[PDB]
């Protein structure tokens, strides 16, 4: 059954006993509750692995994908229990890493998690990403362009669809790039850190990173945190401290790169 | 034309029967014709069937007369869905980016993609004067003080965001070159955390959402905008605007300073 | 002419929502125009305005008429009391309108209908310059009482709705009316600031008031001190000029600059 | 004279809303004046004021009278408890008034009714200069206890309503009353800041208090330190002078400058 | 004497509103004083205070007295639970009072009743200077546990109401009581900042606490670090001095300056102005 | 040992308010201690802690024990679900306590019970220095996954209550436990900033956690980067030292300074 969209009562014992999917507080063994800013989210990891295996097994993955877009959307959802995060203050996602879940991205053994590609509007993030020959590009919160006509570009509307689609394809062993996390930068607000960027963005990036790590996948996402010019280095350090990997691009070329690999953390750099 | 009147009574988000209703009826269940989106924290719905039906009646009519007679019916084209907390299942909702070589437009270049083209500049930039020199078919007037220009039959006055967007989408669908003077109320009304230049970053997301709803509907809208950036960060704010829409023209002294367009044959840059 | 409802109207009851704006619902009558200043919803009723302006013309004594009809004029401009009344009209402005047949003799012979603002800092002499333009009536709002208030031609008001109703009634009755001042609009319409630290909601409020005057074919004149930071005065004054039918900058009770949208185009002086 | 309602009044029930402001509704009695200081709604009842001031005059012993009548003075100035009581009166100020028949002997023989504020930073000696003007009573509000509070002529008050009721009663009873001080108004009336980091709502509050005093034909004198940033003190003092009937700047317990709205026009010194 | 209501009282029900402040209503008994610190409403009950302070004076074991009577002590200072309880008293301060009949031997022989604050930055030596003044008891609030908590005459407290009730009981029982410290008041009383960077609500809170002490004829001593920016320390310290009966500025566990409102006038030293 | 209620408890119903904190009311049982971090109310139950710590001691395999008892440990530290539960305890801290009978061998032989924080900026090597102190278990919280998470001696946690319950259970079971890190406390405990732009509520939260550990006679060690502005690092570190039982400043995975509240007085690296 589809996740409930009716708001679940937080004062009724019968409502609260139901699963997160069904508007209650009780997580099923397949459900992982997490948060991005004040937004609660659930990923159904077991439904995710099953849908990805079905996609891989299908006669035509492109046809299967179109035919099952609603089932896929149900993999990541906002649980609708009222005040659902009330029992889990300062909710992050359990940090995990395995030498048995590494990925060929920039280095042969990148840990599972999130790799962000950072730079301003003239950085050439999309150009550099296209040159890394990904299998699919998830297009989110960006203006429509000729690139969207490609079969390998998948358009999504909200955060839950973006995550459901990207996690599905990454689980199915596609190299997934998300263009972009613009709406996360714009939407995840609150107290700013010494760089001028909301600290809830760093916590959100670690939450998304650790959901990818738990699911043994790698997601690559473009992001422009729009730091003030005097604090760019601090903001970029805070982003690197939140995720499995980070590439800074300028003129569609790598300025710096840092990755948490199966054999240790590495750092590279080349001034523009 | 038979179009429903969207509900204005607030719909309950805790009652299963209310939530099961369509977006036009105060619930959460989108009909095949309904597209839910957001501009800032404002939820909106465009109804594709009300749009195609009413655009056909507009084509068959005299826009000024038609819009006066059908003012009540156009509320069905773009409306705020009145379900309580309607965006709760769709956090950070944008509009799916789309483009087609079969939906291109003759504006500045022969093959401008569907979307939004913004004309940018400060108070003395001459945005209105440059726009009038591009000889549009209709100018929608929104959020600006009354001027002699408002007496013209080709100027249609609107009051809120939903009326502005419904009139614009209907005219563009009916093949009119429509210009909006202006998006001042979007600059003033879409608030939140500021990025560079002191401009709310939610404005850039708002522009992308409007751009992509136009792209989905295969139309091009043109709009004047003054983002009121601080003087030291104008170039950065204008770059952020260009990164949000199908096209942007920077005007000064009612002349083009620079122009950038997403066309069917790639990105075009001038100036 | 009846009093608008002050009981809050339910936004979840269909019978309450179907009612007119004056009756606590959402349905505008043909005579009602819903608009907003900041987060404050307002309605002007064109029929209450025309009917009561005729009663004011018949009295030929504004000072006495306004004291006696304090209750009735609430029908002309009021806050509609439907809960969340602006929910169907996001980013609500007022339709821009102008006509060569609704022009006014103020500074130029053919000033468009709308709002003319007189701008300057504390000590600029806005009141003194205004008095020298020999208006017929001065509406006194949000200013400390002074000897000027004893004059029969000074009409005191308390809130925004009374100020606007009195102003629109006097202007419709063909009086040259000046409002001293829009201090409370500067102080009360706040939110995200643009340059100078002035709330951009103030510019939207001035355009909304301007366009209601334009729709009603009247001209209102108001003194305003936006209290911009000293480094951004020129920018704030340009933003104010971009919001209304006309603007006069005063210093030492003399014109520094003036810009007007007239029936024959934009006029700039100084 | 009866106690105002303290139960919150429903804003959605017609029977509750029809009640007077003292009874938790929205309908002002002829004796009630609704006004606001910041977001705080207030009512002054003219009949409770005139009745109780006559009782105070008859006692000829303010210190004793105020202790015995503490409960009754709640009727003079109170917060009306109707829910969302200011909803029909956005940006509510108080009608500016002046009369040559209500002038006062304070610094000049014909000071208009209103509020006179005494300004100065720390160590200015606002209290020392004020005590040298030989007031009849000093109301003590929001200040730490001092040997001065032992004096029979010092009357301690706790909140804004008690301070205003005691002040209006004493002034109506023809006492020269000084308020030490408006510190809690500076601290409590918050919002968007103007120059100097001073909330512009403070200027509107001072004009509202000034105009209530002017309507009631009394003069109140109050010490205030708006705590402006050092670079903008002159601008903040200009904004205060523009908000009230009179203002004195003190240093070393001496007058540095003074400006008053008098029955014969504005008077300026230094 | 009994613990106050913790059930929230209705503000729309006439019967609930008619009840005393301790019983969840709005009607102050003659023994109740309503005041506020920031947005926190508080009530001190003079009868619970006088009754329990007399019991503390008579106690053969004061340390056990505080633990044994912890439930009754909630009656002395409490948050009244009427909904929107401050609605009829906007900008509520506490009536300023002073008496030559209620003076105290602290730094000077005739300190007025009120609050004396000891001010200084992190590492100023406020605790060390206070301990050198040989107080009878130290209330420990919002500070990390230290050897002091086991070795000296001290009483550990958890929240603002317990801190104030314990302080008022000890001072009424004629103890020289010091509070280490008011850091949770500095951290918790927020809002619009003064030209100093410090919330002006902190100054109003200090005057409210000062005047409750003055009304009850007691003197409380408290350490405070307002955490002013370095360029505005002098302004913040002046605003604090203008809010209370006395203030001592300490640096390197020594008096830098002191100002006190005494029964015979202001007594001060080391002042830069 | 039963699960605390997650249904929100009424604050206007006398029967609901009379219930224990675990059961959604306001009445603390003799075993319950109510405290707060920021606006977050918390309860530690001393009987759930001693009962489950005894079960953990008996298992002698923390990783396996924590997987099997994940539901039970919710009784040790939980958010009480009574509505407005902190309403009778404004500015709630935790009673400061110390005892010569509850000292710990950490850096010095007699460190008082409480919290010891390890501070340093990005690249300071806090985790590396901590690992070199050979702790028995490292709790991993609010940090990106790393090769270190593969170790059996690393236990991953998700929220503040799980982090504190796991830490208190391990310390009560006589494990030297280190927490990597308090990054989510730095991000999550917001409000008015003091010097360096650090929220002063962070200092109060560190004292509350310190004093809960002191009351329970345990020592917890945690890494923290308070992310002060560069000009006020020294002041922020002094404010942190003033809030807890001990603090170590690390740079290049080496001690630059250390201060500890010991059973025999304050110990400083300045000596």
Numbering used by the authors:
A (entry chain F): 35 to 306
B (entry chain A): 32 to 92, 94 to 303
C (entry chain B), D (entry chain C): 34 to 303
E (entry chain D): 34 to 306
F (entry chain E): 34 to 304
Give sentences copied directly from the paper behind this entry.
The lipid-enveloped bacteriophages of the Cystoviridae family infect Gram-negative bacteria, mainly plant-pathogenic Pseudomonas species and share similarities with the members of the Reoviridae family, including bluetongue virus and rotavirus. Their genome of ∼14 kb consists of three dsRNA segments small (S), medium (M) and large (L), which are sequentially encapsidated as ssRNA precursors into the icosahedrally symmetric procapsid by the packaging NTPase P4 (15–23). P4 is a protein of ∼35 kDa, which can assemble into a hexameric ring. NTP-binding sites are located on the external perimeter of the ring at the interfaces between adjacent subunits, whereas the nucleic acid binding sites are found in the central channel. P4 proteins are the only known RNA-specific helicases belonging to helicase Superfamily 4 (SF4).
The ɸ6 P4 was crystallised with ADP-Mg2+ bound in the nucleotide binding site, whereas P4 from ɸ8 and ɸ13 were crystallized in their apo form. Most of the N-terminal domain residues of P4 from ɸ6 and ɸ8 are visible in our crystal structures (starting from amino acid residues 2 and 12, respectively), whereas ɸ13 P4 lacks the first 32 residues [which are predicted to be disordered (60)]. Interestingly, ɸ8 and ɸ13 P4s also lack such a stabilizing helix; however, the first 12 and 31 residues, respectively, are not visible in the crystal structures and might play such a stabilizing role. However in ɸ6 and ɸ13, more than half of their residues can be superimposed with a root-mean-square deviation of 2.1 Å, including two parallel helices and two small anti-parallel β-sheets, creating a topologically identical sub-domain. In ɸ6 and ɸ13, the C-termini are predicted to be disordered with little secondary structure, and indeed, no density for these domains could be found in our crystal structures. The structures of P4 from ɸ6 and ɸ13 show ordered L1 loops, which line the central channel and contact the L2 loops. The L2 loops are found with lysine residues (K239 and K265, respectively) projecting towards the centre of the channel, in the same position as K241 in ɸ12, suggesting a conserved mechanism for binding and translocating RNA. In P4 from ɸ6, ɸ12 and ɸ13, the arginine fingers are pointing towards the catalytic sites, making the subunits competent and primed for hydrolysis. From our structures, we predict similar loose arrangements in P4 from ɸ8 and ɸ13 where F247 (from the same subunit) and F301 (from a neighbouring subunit) seem to be in the correct orientation to stack the nucleotide base.
